[PDB]
Structure formats: C-alpha cells, structure tokens
Amino acid sequence: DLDLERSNRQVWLVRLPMFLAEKWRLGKIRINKSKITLLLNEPHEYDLELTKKVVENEYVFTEQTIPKKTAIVGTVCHECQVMPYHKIVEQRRNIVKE
Amino acid sequence: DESAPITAEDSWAVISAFFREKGLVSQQLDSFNQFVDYTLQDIICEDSTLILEQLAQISRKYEISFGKIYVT
Amino acid sequence: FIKRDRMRRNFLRMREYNEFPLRAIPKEDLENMRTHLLKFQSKKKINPVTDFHLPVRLHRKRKTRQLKVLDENAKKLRFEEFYPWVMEDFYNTWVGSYEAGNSDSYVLLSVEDDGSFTMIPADKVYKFTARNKYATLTIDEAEKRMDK
Amino acid sequence: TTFRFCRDCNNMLYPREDKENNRLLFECRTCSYVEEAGSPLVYRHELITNIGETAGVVQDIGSDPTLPRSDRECPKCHSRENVFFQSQQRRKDTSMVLFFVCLSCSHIFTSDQKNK
Amino acid sequence: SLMSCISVGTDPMPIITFLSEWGMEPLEDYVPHQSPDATRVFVNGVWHG
Amino acid sequence: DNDEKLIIRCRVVAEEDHMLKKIENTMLENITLRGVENIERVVMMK
Amino acid sequence: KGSRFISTLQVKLYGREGSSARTIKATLPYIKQDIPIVIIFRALGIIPDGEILEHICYDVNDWQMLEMLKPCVEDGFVIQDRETALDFIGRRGTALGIKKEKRIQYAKDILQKEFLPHITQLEGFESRKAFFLGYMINRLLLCALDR
Ligand SMILES: [Zn+2]
Ligand SMILES: [Zn+2]
Numbered sequence: 079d080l081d082l083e084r085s086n087r088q089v090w091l092v093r094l095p096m097f098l099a100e101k102w103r104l105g106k107i108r109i110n111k112s113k114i115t116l117l118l119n120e121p122h123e124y125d126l127e128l129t130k131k132v133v134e135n136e137y138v139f140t141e142q143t144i145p146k147k148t149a150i151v152g153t154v155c156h157e158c159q160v161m162p163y164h165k166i167v168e169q170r171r172n173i174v175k176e
Numbered sequence: 177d178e179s180a181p182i183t184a185e186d187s188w189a190v191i192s193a194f195f196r197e198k199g200l201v202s203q204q205l206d207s208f209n210q211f212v213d214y215t216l217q218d219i220i221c222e223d224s225t226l227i228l229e230q231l232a233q234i235s236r237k238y239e240i241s242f243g244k245i246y247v248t
Numbered sequence: 249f250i251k252r253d254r255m256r257r258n259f260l261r262m263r264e265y266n267e268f269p270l271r272a273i274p275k276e277d278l279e280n281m282r283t284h285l286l287k288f289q290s291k292k293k294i295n296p297v298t299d300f301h302l303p304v305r306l307h308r309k310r311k312t313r314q315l316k317v318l319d320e321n322a323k324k325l326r327f328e329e330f331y332p333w334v335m336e337d338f339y340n341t342w343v344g345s346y347e348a349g350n351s352d353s354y355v356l357l358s359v360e361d362d363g364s365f366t367m368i369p370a371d372k373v374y375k376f377t378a379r380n381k382y383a384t385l386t387i388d389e390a391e392k393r394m395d396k
Numbered sequence: 397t398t399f400r401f402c403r404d405c406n407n408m409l410y411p412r413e414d415k416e417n418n419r420l421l422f423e424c425r426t427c428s429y430v431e432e433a434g435s436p437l438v439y440r441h442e443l444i445t446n447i448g449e450t451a452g453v454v455q456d457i458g459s460d461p462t463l464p465r466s467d468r469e470c471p472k473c474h475s476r477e478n479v480f481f482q483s484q485q486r487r488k489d490t491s492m493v494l495f496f497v498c499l500s501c502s503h504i505f506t507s508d509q510k511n512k
Numbered sequence: 513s514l515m516s517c518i519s520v521g522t523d524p525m526p527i528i529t530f531l532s533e534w535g536m537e538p539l540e541d542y543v544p545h546q547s548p549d550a551t552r553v554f555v556n557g558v559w560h561g
Numbered sequence: 562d563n564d565e566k567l568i569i570r571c572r573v574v575a576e577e578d579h580m581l582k583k584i585e586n587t588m589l590e591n592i593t594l595r596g597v598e599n600i601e602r603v604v605m606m607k
Numbered sequence: 608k609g610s611r612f613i614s615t616l617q618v619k620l621y622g623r624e625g626s627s628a629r630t631i632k633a634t635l636p637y638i639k640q641d642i643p644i645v646i647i648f649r650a651l652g653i654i655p656d657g658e659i660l661e662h663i664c665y666d667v668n669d670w671q672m673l674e675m676l677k678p679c680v681e682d683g684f685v686i687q688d689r690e691t692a693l694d695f696i697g698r699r700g701t702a703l704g705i706k707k708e709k710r711i712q713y714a715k716d717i718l719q720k721e722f723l724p725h726i727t728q729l730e731g732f733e734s735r736k737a738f739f740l741g742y743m744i745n746r747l748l749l750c751a752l753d754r
Contacts, residue, residue, distance in 0.1 A: 080305045080335075085297055091285070091370070092355035095533065099353040103369055106269040117267065135288035135295045138356065140281040143331065145307030150297065151283065155359060174530055175523075176217055176244075194515065203518045210520045222609055229316045237316075289658070292404055326730060330712075345652060348731015350540055375734070377654065377689075381404060382426040384687065391695055394685050397670050406657035408680055411578070425684065439582065443589075445671075448754050455549060487753045540734055544665040558726050559739050586627055 080148035087152025089138050092126070093159040097170075122164060130157035212247065220245050268363035278368065283356060285373040288342070292378075301337045308333040335376075344374040397440045402429045411438050448485040450495055450504055458499045468496060468507075475500035480507075524555055537561050612724055618644070618743050620751055629751075630678040631744065636721045638700030644744055645683030649692035650718055651737045656680050662741035663748075672748050 094102075105118045107126075116124040136154035141147060199205075224242030229235070288295050297304065308331040326346070335342050354370035386393070400409050402424035409422035412430065420433035457463070458479060469476045480496045494507040506512065532538065536553060539561040553561060573581070614636050622629035632641035648659045660680075664672045686692055690711070697704065697714035704710035720728045723736050 080307070082297060082302075082304050088359045090357035090359065090365075092353075092357055092367075094353045094355045096353055096529075099355060099369075102272070102355065102367075104269065104271045106267055107365065108265045108267040109363075110265045116270070132293075134293045135286075135290055137286040137297065138283060139286060139306070140283050142281055143307060143309050145305065148306040150304075152358070153296070154285070158357070171530075171533055174526060174533075175214065191515070198517070203520075207518065207520050218608060225318045227316055227318060229314050231311065231313065289655070290404065291406060323729070345733070346731040347540060347734065348729065349735055350538065352538070377652075378404070379654075382687075384426070385691070386687065387691055387694075390686060390691060391698070394682075397674070399673070401657040406655035407684070408656055408660075408677070413577075426687065438578075440670075441585070442671075447671075448752070451754060485754060539738060542738065544661050545667055548666070556725075559742065582627065586625070590625055 080145075082150040085137060085150050085152055088155030089152050090156050090158050091154060093129075095160060095162065095167075116160070122162060122167070125161045126158050127161055128156065129159050133157045216245050216247070266363060268365065270357075270365050270367055273366050273368060282371040283368050284371050285347075285354070286344075287347075287373070287375045288378065289375065290378050300335075300340055303338055304335065306333055306335045341379050342376040343379045344376045347373040347375055397437060400431075402427060405429060445485075449483040449490075451484040453497065453502075453504065455502075457497060466496060470496075470498040470501065470503060471505055472503050473498065473501045528555055528560060531555075531560070614721060614724055616723065616743075618747055620747055624751075628678050629675065630682070631747070635696075635700075635717070637717065638696070640699055642696055642699060643679060643682045644740075645679050646686055646692050646695065647740065648737065649683065649686060649689050650696050650714070651733050651740070652689055653737060654687070654689055656683055659683070659741070662738055663744045665745070671752060672745075675748060675751070 105116045107114065107116050112128070114126055116122075116126065118124075133154045133156060138151040138154060140149055140151055142149070220242045226240055228238035230237060332344055334344070350373045351370075354373065356368040356370055358366045358368070360366060400422060401407060402409060405424050405426045407424050407426055409424055409431070411433065412421040412423040414421050420436065420438075421430050422433060423430045460479065463479045463481060466478055466480050467476050468478065470478065475498055477500065478496050478498045480494050482492055482494060483490050496505050496507060497503070498505070531553065537547075537550070539559065542550075542561065552559060573584075616634070616636075618631065618633045619641060620629065620631050630643070632643050633647055634641045635647075645656070645659060648662070653659055653662070660673060660676055663676065666672075686695060693711045693714050694707065696718075697707075697710040701710075701713070701717075704713050718733065718736075719730050723739065726732065726736055726739060
C-alpha cells in the first residue's frame with residue numbers, strides 16, 4: 079500500500095565536514111541575497127555553497143518478494159555542501175594502530 | 177652570515193649528519209623493526225577468530241580468539 | 249688538494265539577508281523511519297514521480313561436529329538484504345542499487361512552510377535505473393544468437 | 397564520426413537510408429526513435445592523422461618545471477615568456493616540429509617555417 | 513647507492529581522509545562531460561575521485 | 562593531377578554499409594598498385 | 608596486506624592494425640573465455656551504451672576513440688540487459704554452480720570480491736570499480752592510437 083504523501087516538499091542535501099556530521103549521527107541560517115551562512119548555537123558561522131543549482135531525478139523517501147511500508151518525502155530541491163574560531167578547526171584538520 | 181648561501185664543501189657536513197642518524201645498514205633494521213611492531217599484531221588479528229560448530233539432539237559453539245601478542 | 253681533518257682545531261678556535269533557524273527533529277520520527285536518497289540514470293531531466301503516474305508501489309523483489317566461518321554484523325546484515333526494490337504503476341519500472349560508498353556525510357535539510365528547517369541524517373543512497381525501456385528480453389535466446 | 401545518441405535509450409544511432417524519400421536518417425535499433433541526418437558524412441578513417449600533436453595542453457602547463465623555456469615572442473600578445481615541447485603524438489615518422497605555448501594568452505604557435 | 517633507502521611504508525587512510533576535506537570530489541559524483549578539466553586523483557593505484 | 566586536391570569516388574550496383582566498409586579494406590590492403598610483392602625500401606647505391 | 612594475492616586482470620585488444628573489427632575483450636579470474644568489455648559493464652550495472660562511452664572516453668570532441676569503440680558497442684547491442692549479462696558471465700565459466708539461480712548470484716559475487724581485489728571487495732562499490740575499468744580501456748586504446 080505504497081503512498082506518495084506529497085513530494086511537494088523541497089529538501090536540501092548537505093555534505094557536512096565529517097566530525098560535525100558524525101557528532102550529529104541547533105543552528106540558524108542567514109540567507110544572503112547568493113551567499114548564505116549558518117549562525118550556530120555556541121559557535122562558528124559557515125557559508126554553504128550552492129553546489130548544484132539544478133538537481134532533478136533526485137528525490138527523498140522513507141520506510142516504515144517482501145513489500146513493505148513505503149512513503150515518499152519530497153524533492154531534492156538543491157544540492158549543498160557546507161564551507162567553514164575557524165583557526166582551531168583548521169588546526170584540528172591539520173592534526174589529521176598499536 | 178647565517179642566511180648566506182652555502183659552498184659545495186659545506187654539503188659534506190649534511191651527509192655526516194645523515195649517516196650519524198641512519199647508519200649504513202639501517203634500512204634492514206628499520207624494515208625489520210616495523211615488521212616486529214606492526215605486522216605480528218596485524219597478522220594475528222586478521223584471522224584469529226575460529227569457532228567450532230557443535231550439534232546435539234541442542235546445537236553448540238566453541239570459540240578461540242587471539243589477542244595482543246607478546247614478544248620476549 | 250688534500251682532505252682537511254684539522255676541523256676540530258678550526259671549529260674549536262671559531263666557536264538583504266534572512267535568518268532562518270535549524271532544528272534536530274525528535275528522534276521518535278527517526279526511530280519510525282529511515283531516509284534514503286533517490287537518483288535516476290534517465291538523462292530525462294524532469295522525471296517527477298507525479299509524471300510517473302500511478303498506482304505507485306515500491307517494493308523489494310548428517311553433519312558431524314563441523315566448522316563455521318566468521319563474519320561482521322554490518323556487512324552480514326547488508327548482504328542478507330539482497331532483494332532490491334523497484335517501483336511501478338499498474339508500465340514504468342525503476343530498479344535501484346545501493347550506492348554503498350556515499351553513506352558518508354549527508355545531512356538532509358527539509359524546507360518547511362516557514363523558512364526554518366528540520367534536518368535528518370541520510371541513511372543510505374540508491375540509484376534507480378529506468379529498466380525495460382525498449383522492452384526486449386532476449387535472454388538465453390540472445391546468447392544462442394550470439395553463438396553465431 | 398561525431399555520431400549522436402538516442403533519447404532515453406542513449407544508445408548510438410546507426411545510419412538508415414530512407415528509400416521512400418531517398419534521404420539519410422539515424423535509427424536506434426532498440427526502439428522506434430529515428431531522427432534526420434545533418435550531413436551526408438557518415439564514416440571517416442583518416443589514415444594519415446595530424447591530430448594529437450597539440451594534445452595534452454593543460455591550463456597549468458605554464459607551471460611545469462621540467463619543461464624548457466624560450467625567449468621567442470608570441471605572434472598575438474608579443475610576450476617572449478613561453479614554454480615549448482614537441483609533438484605529443486608518438487610515432488616513428490612524427491616530425492620534431494616544436495609547439496611553443498605562450499604563458500600570457502595560452503596560445504599555441506609552432507616553430508615550423510614551411511607550413512603554418 | 514650510499515644515500516638510497518627503502519621505504520617501509522605507512523597507512524593510506526589518513527591521507528585519503530584528508531583529501532575529501534580539502535575538496536576532492538568523490539568518484540561517484542563524477543560526470544566526465546560536465547567537469548572536463550578536473551585532475552583525477554590516484555592513491556596507491558586506487559582511484560578515489 | 563591538375564587538381565590541387567586528389568579525389569577518388571566509387572559506388573556499387575540489406576545493410577549495405579558493412580559490405581562497403583569491407584570493400585574499403587580490400588582497397589587499401591589488398592590492392593597492389595605496381596611492383597613486386599614482399600619487397601620494400603629499394604635503395605639506389607653507387 | 609594479507610593473503611599475498613596473485614590475481615591478475617588483463618584487457619586485450621584483438622586484431623592487427625589496418626584490419627577492421629578490432630575489438631576489445633577482457634579476461635577475468637576463474638572464467639575460461641575472455642568477456643567483451645561492454646558485457647562487463649552491463650554486469651557492473653551500466654546498461655546504456657552512451658554511459659559506457661562516457662566512462663571509457665573522457666573527451667566528447669575526439670571522434671577516433673569513440674570510433675574504435677563501435678565494434679564493442681555492437682556486441683553490447685547483442686546483449687542488452689544487466690541480468691542477462693550476469694547470467695551470460697556465469698554460464699561462461701566455473702560450471703560447478705550447476706544451478707542458474709545460484710550461478711547468477713555467484714557471478715555477481717565474483718565481481719564484488721575477486722574482480723579487482725583492490726579498490727574494495729565490499730558490496731555496492733560496483734560503480735566505483737566501473738570507472739577504473741573504463742580508465743584501463745582508455746589507456747589501452749590511448750596506446751593503440753600511438754598517443
Ligand atoms: Zn533508442
Ligand atoms: Zn602569446
């Protein structure tokens with residue numbers, strides 16, 4: 079009984095620098111009108127690049143022969159990677175068995 | 177002065193400071209040392225786990241693992 | 249002309265904008281559902297599933313004492329899931345495949361009615377073939393023809 | 397030679413003679429898609445091949461330390477700072493004619509005084 | 513030769529990791545026609561992007 | 562020979578192309594224009 | 608590190624220069640006969656020929672390479688589907704499977720594991736191996752063009 083809820087929803091995909099993404103495994107976005115950034119809770123601000131302006135054929139879904147519980151989320155609207163006290167993070171990046 | 181360019185004869189001083197560090201037959205010693213520190217631990221770790229499957233009529237397992245290796 | 253060793257004597261005698269907040273959803277929703285990207289190989293740019301028509305479905309298609317060989321939990325689970333899914337109307341058919349390298353870092357930003365967003369971590373990523381377009385399945389017969 | 401691909405089949409188009417209109421088309425044997433030809437040309441072998449001589453020119457070529465430098469001025473921007481190298485096609489009969497690459501306009505200009 | 517030495521080798525993982533963070537595009541996103549001039553990147557004969 | 566561009570054109574009396582492109586090879590390789598086979602690079606020497 | 612692998616891949620360009628229908632077939636581990644490259648790509652899961660050309664040749668402008676591709680494209684036209692390709696590869700070699708249901712999975716398993724033991728043996732990286740293969744094909748042709 080698969081059902082498309084909307085697909086109308088637009089989502090953006092983020093490639094996030096790895097340590098923060100792993101930690102996630104809240105902020106506030108300021109959009110500058112074609113340059114945009116994130117004001118974090120404390121901390122850094124970040125710029126996010128418009129990575130791919132046109133993203134089509136790419137949609138997001140969820141789950142709940144074996145058919146299973148199925149629903150659609152929405153469309154990938156735009157592709158984005160995050161860009162980045164930034165001195166400390168750069169130094170940690172530089173630092174990067176028995 | 178300290179920042180001046182260097183003459184050719186100077187270069188020998190470098191080479192001395194090289195062999196003081198390395199020694200003539202060093203690659204043998206360093207390669208072997210790396211093998212002793214890392215390879216033994218990795219070889220043992222890679223395939224250590226072995227399990228025996230025991231059947232009864234209830235089925236059963238036996239298992240032996242290999243840990244940190246010790247050298248004398 | 250000769251080699252100078254008197255360097256012991258020499259060295260001794262010398263020395264508008266808009267600010268929209270972000271939030272992590274209550275994990276209960278996350279607990280209910282895993283989220284997976286969708287990608288098509290079509291080259292047909294549009295491909296909205298609305299265009300795909302309907303009805304939509306999306307579904308996946310005596311020994312003595314002896315030895316067992318060992319394996320990992322994550323790999324074993326992924327391997328045990330080899331029935332790939334698929335979708336159709338009652339016909340257009342897409343067949344997906346685990347990207348497997350891109351799990352990596354993918355953070356979802358859902359645009360909601362208000363400019364604020366919710367963000368969910370991406371589970372996996374899949375790549376959907378558009379399959380059986382010209383609809384000739386020539387199979388064993390095709391291989392036999394090849395044997396020409 | 398510069399053959400196209402089908403739509404949604406993406407496969408290469410094989411030329412089809414139209415006997416009805418006596419004109420050339422392109423068929424995709426996996427589907428019904430056929431479109432018109434843009435040229436009577438179909439196949440070109442080009443036995444003797446002069447292309448690939450200038451191959452490998454890169455935006456960063458001026459940064460290559462292993463390449464020699466020359467003082468000859470460019471015909472366009474008249475910049476005497478340039479890097480030169482021989483024909484990239486590797487074959488027995490390949491001529492030794494140099495290709496000078498300016499470091500200003502990136503232009504490629506040869507050293508050959510016979511044919512230009 | 514006197515000053516020649518033989519490499520004892522290291523682990524590729526930290527390097528491979530380090531690349532992506534500096535903007536290496538992962539192989540799977542590569543579209544040859546669309547990004548023609550990009551230099552492709554090998555590590556120990558394995559091509560990561 | 563007067564033509565600054567040397568041109569040669571040919572035609573013939575069910576998938577015709579492979580047959581033609583086939584004939585192209587016979588033209589290049591399988592036609593000995595003149596001279597004795599197997600011989601190459603005949604050098605005049607005084 | 609480990610197992611001291613001898614496994615070797617070869618990519619062979621058939622036919623002598625000047626003779627048309629020079630084609631490209633590739634050997635695999637445990638398979639008796641060489642398998643054409645388009646077939647290998649179909650097994651990897653890339654059906655459409657245009658995509659395969661894109662993987663092999665990275666410059667749309669060069670006609671020459673694309674030209675020498677067409678024989679391989681023709682064989683690919685003969686075998687048009689992924690599953691059909693996997694069945695074909697499995698049938699071509701290692702007859703101990705004896706059962707079609709297991710043999711196709713077995714061919715896929717070989718591609719994931721034994722084919723190109725570097726890169727990865729993990730599942731889902733087929734896309735990753737695909738390009739590296741095309742890269743080889745590129746380099747080989749790029750030799751046959753005397754570049
Ligand atoms: Zn088509
Ligand atoms: Zn110039």
